[PDB]
PDB file of all heavy atoms in Angstrom:
ATOM      1  N   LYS I 750      71.203  50.121 117.564  1.00  0.00           N
ATOM      2  CA  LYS I 750      72.147  49.563 116.603  1.00  0.00           C
ATOM      3  C   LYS I 750      73.582  50.039 116.791  1.00  0.00           C
ATOM      4  O   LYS I 750      74.516  49.284 116.556  1.00  0.00           O
ATOM      5  CB  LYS I 750      71.676  49.853 115.165  1.00  0.00           C
ATOM      6  CG  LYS I 750      71.453  51.325 114.845  1.00  0.00           C
ATOM      7  CD  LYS I 750      70.804  51.492 113.485  1.00  0.00           C
ATOM      8  CE  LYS I 750      70.701  52.952 113.080  1.00  0.00           C
ATOM      9  NZ  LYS I 750      72.045  53.568 112.867  1.00  0.00           N
ATOM     10  N   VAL I 751      73.762  51.283 117.218  1.00  0.00           N
ATOM     11  CA  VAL I 751      75.095  51.840 117.429  1.00  0.00           C
ATOM     12  C   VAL I 751      75.339  52.155 118.902  1.00  0.00           C
ATOM     13  O   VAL I 751      74.616  52.960 119.501  1.00  0.00           O
ATOM     14  CB  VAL I 751      75.311  53.149 116.630  1.00  0.00           C
ATOM     15  CG1 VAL I 751      76.687  53.707 116.908  1.00  0.00           C
ATOM     16  CG2 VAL I 751      75.131  52.891 115.146  1.00  0.00           C
ATOM     17  N   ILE I 752      76.355  51.528 119.470  1.00  0.00           N
ATOM     18  CA  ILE I 752      76.695  51.739 120.864  1.00  0.00           C
ATOM     19  C   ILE I 752      78.024  52.485 120.959  1.00  0.00           C
ATOM     20  O   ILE I 752      79.049  52.001 120.486  1.00  0.00           O
ATOM     21  CB  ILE I 752      76.790  50.385 121.597  1.00  0.00           C
ATOM     22  CG1 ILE I 752      75.492  49.607 121.379  1.00  0.00           C
ATOM     23  CG2 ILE I 752      77.034  50.624 123.078  1.00  0.00           C
ATOM     24  CD1 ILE I 752      75.477  48.230 121.983  1.00  0.00           C
ATOM     25  N   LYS I 753      77.980  53.666 121.569  1.00  0.00           N
ATOM     26  CA  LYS I 753      79.152  54.511 121.711  1.00  0.00           C
ATOM     27  C   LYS I 753      79.738  54.435 123.115  1.00  0.00           C
ATOM     28  O   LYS I 753      79.878  55.456 123.793  1.00  0.00           O
ATOM     29  CB  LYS I 753      78.788  55.955 121.372  1.00  0.00           C
ATOM     30  CG  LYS I 753      78.259  56.151 119.957  1.00  0.00           C
ATOM     31  CD  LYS I 753      77.795  57.575 119.744  1.00  0.00           C
ATOM     32  CE  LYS I 753      77.296  57.805 118.328  1.00  0.00           C
ATOM     33  NZ  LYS I 753      76.871  59.216 118.145  1.00  0.00           N
ATOM     34  N   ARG I 754      80.082  53.232 123.560  1.00  0.00           N
ATOM     35  CA  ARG I 754      80.642  53.060 124.884  1.00  0.00           C
ATOM     36  C   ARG I 754      81.089  51.630 125.046  1.00  0.00           C
ATOM     37  O   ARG I 754      80.888  50.812 124.155  1.00  0.00           O
ATOM     38  CB  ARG I 754      79.606  53.375 125.958  1.00  0.00           C
ATOM     39  CG  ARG I 754      78.413  52.409 126.001  1.00  0.00           C
ATOM     40  CD  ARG I 754      77.517  52.771 127.172  1.00  0.00           C
ATOM     41  NE  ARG I 754      76.302  51.965 127.287  1.00  0.00           N
ATOM     42  CZ  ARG I 754      76.260  50.720 127.759  1.00  0.00           C
ATOM     43  NH1 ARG I 754      77.366  50.109 128.165  1.00  0.00           N
ATOM     44  NH2 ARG I 754      75.100  50.088 127.826  1.00  0.00           N
ATOM     45  N   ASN I 755      81.678  51.332 126.192  1.00  0.00           N
ATOM     46  CA  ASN I 755      82.131  49.981 126.457  1.00  0.00           C
ATOM     47  C   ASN I 755      80.981  49.157 127.018  1.00  0.00           C
ATOM     48  O   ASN I 755      80.140  49.653 127.770  1.00  0.00           O
ATOM     49  CB  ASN I 755      83.292  49.980 127.453  1.00  0.00           C
ATOM     50  CG  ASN I 755      84.478  50.779 126.968  1.00  0.00           C
ATOM     51  OD1 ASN I 755      84.919  50.626 125.826  1.00  0.00           O
ATOM     52  ND2 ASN I 755      85.010  51.637 127.832  1.00  0.00           N
ATOM     53  N   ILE I 756      80.959  47.889 126.625  1.00  0.00           N
ATOM     54  CA  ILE I 756      79.952  46.953 127.102  1.00  0.00           C
ATOM     55  C   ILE I 756      80.640  46.190 128.216  1.00  0.00           C
ATOM     56  O   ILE I 756      81.370  45.231 127.979  1.00  0.00           O
ATOM     57  CB  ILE I 756      79.520  45.998 125.996  1.00  0.00           C
ATOM     58  CG1 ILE I 756      79.000  46.804 124.799  1.00  0.00           C
ATOM     59  CG2 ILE I 756      78.429  45.068 126.524  1.00  0.00           C
ATOM     60  CD1 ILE I 756      78.620  45.957 123.610  1.00  0.00           C
ATOM     61  N   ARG I 757      80.406  46.651 129.440  1.00  0.00           N
ATOM     62  CA  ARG I 757      81.019  46.065 130.627  1.00  0.00           C
ATOM     63  C   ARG I 757      80.635  44.638 130.951  1.00  0.00           C
ATOM     64  O   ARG I 757      79.684  44.086 130.398  1.00  0.00           O
ATOM     65  CB  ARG I 757      80.729  46.961 131.823  1.00  0.00           C
ATOM     66  CG  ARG I 757      81.136  48.392 131.584  1.00  0.00           C
ATOM     67  CD  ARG I 757      81.026  49.250 132.823  1.00  0.00           C
ATOM     68  NE  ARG I 757      81.362  50.635 132.534  1.00  0.00           N
ATOM     69  CZ  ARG I 757      81.418  51.602 133.441  1.00  0.00           C
ATOM     70  NH1 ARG I 757      81.178  51.334 134.713  1.00  0.00           N
ATOM     71  NH2 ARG I 757      81.723  52.838 133.077  1.00  0.00           N
ATOM     72  N   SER I 758      81.411  44.033 131.843  1.00  0.00           N
ATOM     73  CA  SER I 758      81.185  42.662 132.291  1.00  0.00           C
ATOM     74  C   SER I 758      79.801  42.587 132.973  1.00  0.00           C
ATOM     75  O   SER I 758      79.436  43.474 133.740  1.00  0.00           O
ATOM     76  CB  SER I 758      82.281  42.250 133.282  1.00  0.00           C
ATOM     77  OG  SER I 758      82.067  40.937 133.775  1.00  0.00           O
ATOM     78  N   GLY I 759      79.046  41.530 132.680  1.00  0.00           N
ATOM     79  CA  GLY I 759      77.726  41.394 133.271  1.00  0.00           C
ATOM     80  C   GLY I 759      76.618  41.944 132.375  1.00  0.00           C
ATOM     81  O   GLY I 759      75.469  41.524 132.475  1.00  0.00           O
ATOM     82  N   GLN I 760      76.972  42.881 131.497  1.00  0.00           N
ATOM     83  CA  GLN I 760      75.975  43.465 130.605  1.00  0.00           C
ATOM     84  C   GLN I 760      75.704  42.619 129.368  1.00  0.00           C
ATOM     85  O   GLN I 760      76.558  41.850 128.936  1.00  0.00           O
ATOM     86  CB  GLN I 760      76.426  44.862 130.190  1.00  0.00           C
ATOM     87  CG  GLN I 760      76.522  45.837 131.343  1.00  0.00           C
ATOM     88  CD  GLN I 760      77.012  47.204 130.892  1.00  0.00           C
ATOM     89  OE1 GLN I 760      77.036  48.159 131.673  1.00  0.00           O
ATOM     90  NE2 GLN I 760      77.410  47.302 129.634  1.00  0.00           N
ATOM     91  N   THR I 761      74.503  42.747 128.820  1.00  0.00           N
ATOM     92  CA  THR I 761      74.102  42.005 127.627  1.00  0.00           C
ATOM     93  C   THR I 761      73.430  42.925 126.608  1.00  0.00           C
ATOM     94  O   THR I 761      72.362  43.484 126.869  1.00  0.00           O
ATOM     95  CB  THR I 761      73.122  40.840 127.952  1.00  0.00           C
ATOM     96  OG1 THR I 761      73.779  39.832 128.726  1.00  0.00           O
ATOM     97  CG2 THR I 761      72.604  40.214 126.670  1.00  0.00           C
ATOM     98  N   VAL I 762      74.062  43.068 125.452  1.00  0.00           N
ATOM     99  CA  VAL I 762      73.536  43.895 124.370  1.00  0.00           C
ATOM    100  C   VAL I 762      72.720  43.012 123.451  1.00  0.00           C
ATOM    101  O   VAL I 762      73.154  41.922 123.092  1.00  0.00           O
ATOM    102  CB  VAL I 762      74.684  44.552 123.566  1.00  0.00           C
ATOM    103  CG1 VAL I 762      74.186  45.014 122.194  1.00  0.00           C
ATOM    104  CG2 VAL I 762      75.239  45.720 124.351  1.00  0.00           C
ATOM    105  N   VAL I 763      71.535  43.491 123.063  1.00  0.00           N
ATOM    106  CA  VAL I 763      70.660  42.734 122.173  1.00  0.00           C
ATOM    107  C   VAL I 763      70.164  43.579 121.001  1.00  0.00           C
ATOM    108  O   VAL I 763      69.809  44.741 121.173  1.00  0.00           O
ATOM    109  CB  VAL I 763      69.420  42.192 122.931  1.00  0.00           C
ATOM    110  CG1 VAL I 763      68.522  41.436 121.988  1.00  0.00           C
ATOM    111  CG2 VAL I 763      69.854  41.302 124.090  1.00  0.00           C
ATOM    112  N   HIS I 764      70.128  42.993 119.813  1.00  0.00           N
ATOM    113  CA  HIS I 764      69.635  43.718 118.658  1.00  0.00           C
ATOM    114  C   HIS I 764      69.359  42.799 117.490  1.00  0.00           C
ATOM    115  O   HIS I 764      70.168  41.939 117.166  1.00  0.00           O
ATOM    116  CB  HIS I 764      70.614  44.814 118.254  1.00  0.00           C
ATOM    117  CG  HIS I 764      69.928  46.087 117.900  1.00  0.00           C
ATOM    118  ND1 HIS I 764      69.358  46.304 116.663  1.00  0.00           N
ATOM    119  CD2 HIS I 764      69.596  47.157 118.661  1.00  0.00           C
ATOM    120  CE1 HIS I 764      68.695  47.445 116.687  1.00  0.00           C
ATOM    121  NE2 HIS I 764      68.818  47.987 117.888  1.00  0.00           N
ATOM    122  N   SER I 765      68.213  42.985 116.853  1.00  0.00           N
ATOM    123  CA  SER I 765      67.855  42.115 115.736  1.00  0.00           C
ATOM    124  C   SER I 765      68.571  42.467 114.423  1.00  0.00           C
ATOM    125  O   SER I 765      68.387  41.800 113.411  1.00  0.00           O
ATOM    126  CB  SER I 765      66.346  42.136 115.511  1.00  0.00           C
ATOM    127  OG  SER I 765      65.893  43.435 115.174  1.00  0.00           O
ATOM    128  N   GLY I 766      69.371  43.524 114.445  1.00  0.00           N
ATOM    129  CA  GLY I 766      70.089  43.911 113.233  1.00  0.00           C
ATOM    130  C   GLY I 766      71.581  43.803 113.451  1.00  0.00           C
ATOM    131  O   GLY I 766      72.034  43.014 114.287  1.00  0.00           O
ATOM    132  N   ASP I 767      72.334  44.601 112.705  1.00  0.00           N
ATOM    133  CA  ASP I 767      73.789  44.626 112.840  1.00  0.00           C
ATOM    134  C   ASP I 767      74.090  45.563 113.994  1.00  0.00           C
ATOM    135  O   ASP I 767      73.493  46.631 114.118  1.00  0.00           O
ATOM    136  CB  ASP I 767      74.440  45.158 111.564  1.00  0.00           C
ATOM    137  CG  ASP I 767      74.010  44.399 110.326  1.00  0.00           C
ATOM    138  OD1 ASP I 767      74.087  43.154 110.345  1.00  0.00           O
ATOM    139  OD2 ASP I 767      73.586  45.037 109.350  1.00  0.00           O
ATOM    140  N   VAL I 768      75.023  45.147 114.838  1.00  0.00           N
ATOM    141  CA  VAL I 768      75.418  45.928 115.999  1.00  0.00           C
ATOM    142  C   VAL I 768      76.815  46.495 115.773  1.00  0.00           C
ATOM    143  O   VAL I 768      77.723  45.768 115.398  1.00  0.00           O
ATOM    144  CB  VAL I 768      75.456  45.035 117.259  1.00  0.00           C
ATOM    145  CG1 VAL I 768      75.866  45.858 118.461  1.00  0.00           C
ATOM    146  CG2 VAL I 768      74.090  44.394 117.479  1.00  0.00           C
ATOM    147  N   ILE I 769      76.982  47.795 115.978  1.00  0.00           N
ATOM    148  CA  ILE I 769      78.289  48.412 115.806  1.00  0.00           C
ATOM    149  C   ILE I 769      78.645  49.027 117.150  1.00  0.00           C
ATOM    150  O   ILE I 769      77.902  49.850 117.676  1.00  0.00           O
ATOM    151  CB  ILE I 769      78.263  49.529 114.752  1.00  0.00           C
ATOM    152  CG1 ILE I 769      77.926  48.952 113.377  1.00  0.00           C
ATOM    153  CG2 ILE I 769      79.620  50.220 114.719  1.00  0.00           C
ATOM    154  CD1 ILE I 769      77.640  50.015 112.343  1.00  0.00           C
ATOM    155  N   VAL I 770      79.779  48.601 117.705  1.00  0.00           N
ATOM    156  CA  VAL I 770      80.207  49.121 118.990  1.00  0.00           C
ATOM    157  C   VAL I 770      81.470  49.972 118.882  1.00  0.00           C
ATOM    158  O   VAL I 770      82.555  49.471 118.572  1.00  0.00           O
ATOM    159  CB  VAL I 770      80.485  47.959 120.005  1.00  0.00           C
ATOM    160  CG1 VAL I 770      80.893  48.534 121.356  1.00  0.00           C
ATOM    161  CG2 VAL I 770      79.257  47.083 120.159  1.00  0.00           C
ATOM    162  N   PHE I 771      81.328  51.267 119.119  1.00  0.00           N
ATOM    163  CA  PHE I 771      82.487  52.147 119.095  1.00  0.00           C
ATOM    164  C   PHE I 771      82.997  52.169 120.533  1.00  0.00           C
ATOM    165  O   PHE I 771      82.717  53.087 121.297  1.00  0.00           O
ATOM    166  CB  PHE I 771      82.108  53.543 118.602  1.00  0.00           C
ATOM    167  CG  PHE I 771      81.826  53.596 117.120  1.00  0.00           C
ATOM    168  CD1 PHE I 771      80.524  53.736 116.651  1.00  0.00           C
ATOM    169  CD2 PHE I 771      82.860  53.426 116.201  1.00  0.00           C
ATOM    170  CE1 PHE I 771      80.262  53.702 115.280  1.00  0.00           C
ATOM    171  CE2 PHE I 771      82.610  53.379 114.837  1.00  0.00           C
ATOM    172  CZ  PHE I 771      81.303  53.515 114.373  1.00  0.00           C
ATOM    173  N   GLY I 772      83.737  51.120 120.880  1.00  0.00           N
ATOM    174  CA  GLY I 772      84.281  50.972 122.215  1.00  0.00           C
ATOM    175  C   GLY I 772      84.627  49.504 122.395  1.00  0.00           C
ATOM    176  O   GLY I 772      84.684  48.764 121.410  1.00  0.00           O
ATOM    177  N   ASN I 773      84.853  49.050 123.625  1.00  0.00           N
ATOM    178  CA  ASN I 773      85.202  47.649 123.824  1.00  0.00           C
ATOM    179  C   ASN I 773      84.104  46.823 124.462  1.00  0.00           C
ATOM    180  O   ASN I 773      83.240  47.333 125.171  1.00  0.00           O
ATOM    181  CB  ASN I 773      86.465  47.519 124.676  1.00  0.00           C
ATOM    182  CG  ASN I 773      87.622  48.343 124.133  1.00  0.00           C
ATOM    183  OD1 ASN I 773      88.039  48.161 122.990  1.00  0.00           O
ATOM    184  ND2 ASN I 773      88.125  49.250 124.950  1.00  0.00           N
ATOM    185  N   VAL I 774      84.162  45.523 124.185  1.00  0.00           N
ATOM    186  CA  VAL I 774      83.234  44.561 124.757  1.00  0.00           C
ATOM    187  C   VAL I 774      84.060  43.716 125.717  1.00  0.00           C
ATOM    188  O   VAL I 774      84.796  42.820 125.304  1.00  0.00           O
ATOM    189  CB  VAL I 774      82.623  43.674 123.662  1.00  0.00           C
ATOM    190  CG1 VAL I 774      81.654  42.693 124.292  1.00  0.00           C
ATOM    191  CG2 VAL I 774      81.895  44.528 122.632  1.00  0.00           C
ATOM    192  N   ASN I 775      83.945  44.015 127.016  1.00  0.00           N
ATOM    193  CA  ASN I 775      84.701  43.309 128.058  1.00  0.00           C
ATOM    194  C   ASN I 775      84.421  41.812 128.196  1.00  0.00           C
ATOM    195  O   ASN I 775      83.410  41.306 127.718  1.00  0.00           O
ATOM    196  CB  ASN I 775      84.487  44.008 129.400  1.00  0.00           C
ATOM    197  CG  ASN I 775      84.909  45.464 129.368  1.00  0.00           C
ATOM    198  OD1 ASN I 775      84.828  46.172 130.376  1.00  0.00           O
ATOM    199  ND2 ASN I 775      85.368  45.924 128.218  1.00  0.00           N
ATOM    200  N   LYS I 776      85.325  41.114 128.872  1.00  0.00           N
ATOM    201  CA  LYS I 776      85.234  39.670 129.090  1.00  0.00           C
ATOM    202  C   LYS I 776      83.881  39.150 129.559  1.00  0.00           C
ATOM    203  O   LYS I 776      83.352  38.192 128.995  1.00  0.00           O
ATOM    204  CB  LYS I 776      86.314  39.214 130.083  1.00  0.00           C
ATOM    205  CG  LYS I 776      87.727  39.529 129.664  1.00  0.00           C
ATOM    206  CD  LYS I 776      88.745  38.937 130.633  1.00  0.00           C
ATOM    207  CE  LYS I 776      90.175  39.295 130.217  1.00  0.00           C
ATOM    208  NZ  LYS I 776      91.209  38.646 131.057  1.00  0.00           N
ATOM    209  N   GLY I 777      83.329  39.746 130.602  1.00  0.00           N
ATOM    210  CA  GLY I 777      82.046  39.290 131.109  1.00  0.00           C
ATOM    211  C   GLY I 777      80.846  39.800 130.333  1.00  0.00           C
ATOM    212  O   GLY I 777      79.708  39.635 130.774  1.00  0.00           O
ATOM    213  N   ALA I 778      81.084  40.422 129.173  1.00  0.00           N
ATOM    214  CA  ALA I 778      79.996  40.960 128.365  1.00  0.00           C
ATOM    215  C   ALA I 778      79.475  39.979 127.335  1.00  0.00           C
ATOM    216  O   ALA I 778      80.065  38.922 127.101  1.00  0.00           O
ATOM    217  CB  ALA I 778      80.442  42.231 127.673  1.00  0.00           C
TER     218      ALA I 778
END
Side-chain angles (χ1 to χ4, degrees):
Chain I
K750 56 188 186 66
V751 178
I752 306 177
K753 300 175 178 181
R754 66 176 177 77
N755 301 312
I756 303 176
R757 307 188 183 184
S758 178
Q760 297 178 173
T761 293
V762 161
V763 179
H764 223 279
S765 62
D767 306 309
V768 180
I769 296 169
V770 182
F771 287 107
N773 307 302
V774 180
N775 302 181
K776 302 185 181 185

